[PDB]
């Protein structure tokens, strides 16, 4: 079927975020789980204490495409001016990467 949940397992940053030539950043994620297809819990936040989404996901609503473990997904994003964190996963699964834009 096509009833997909949020991915339940940890991701890793397979390649750390890098700037494009059009004012965005791209980040390669690797998914450790086998519950794909599943929706990636990714957002950009002001701090780890307030996970209100800010910034802009350019690759919006990305999915892990497969139940195969260690699948990779590339996400393009536009962090806000100033400080933010890219956060993937929730609770004890959460990984984070700080970003500063001047």
Query: What residues line the site for a copy of itself (CB under 8 A)?
Result: 2, 4, 15, 18-21, 26, 28, 37, 57-66, 68, 71-76
If the CB atoms of residues 75 and 87 are measured against a copy of itself, the closer one turns out to be 75
Peptide bond into 37 cis (omega under 30): yes
Paired tokens of 78: 């536009």
Shortest CB 37 distance to a copy of itself, Å: 5
How many CA atoms does the CB half-sphere of 75 hold within 13 Å?
31
If the CB atoms of residues 22 and 50 are measured against a copy of itself, the closer one turns out to be 22
């Amino acid at each position: 079927g096509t009833t997909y949940g949020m991915c339940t397992k940890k991701f890793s940053f397979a390649k750390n975020p890098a700037d494009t030539g059009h004012g965005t950043v791209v980040l390669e994620l690797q998914y450790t789980g086998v519950d794909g297809p599943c929706k990636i819990p990714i957002s950009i936040v002001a701090s780890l204490s307030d996970l209100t989404p800010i910034g802009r996901m350019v690759t919006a609503n990305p999915y892990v495409a497969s139940s195969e473990a260690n699948s990779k997904v590339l996400v393009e994003m536009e962090p806000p001016f100033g400080d933010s964190f890219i956060v993937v996963g929730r609770g004890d699964k959460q990984i984070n990467h700080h970003w500063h834009k001047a």
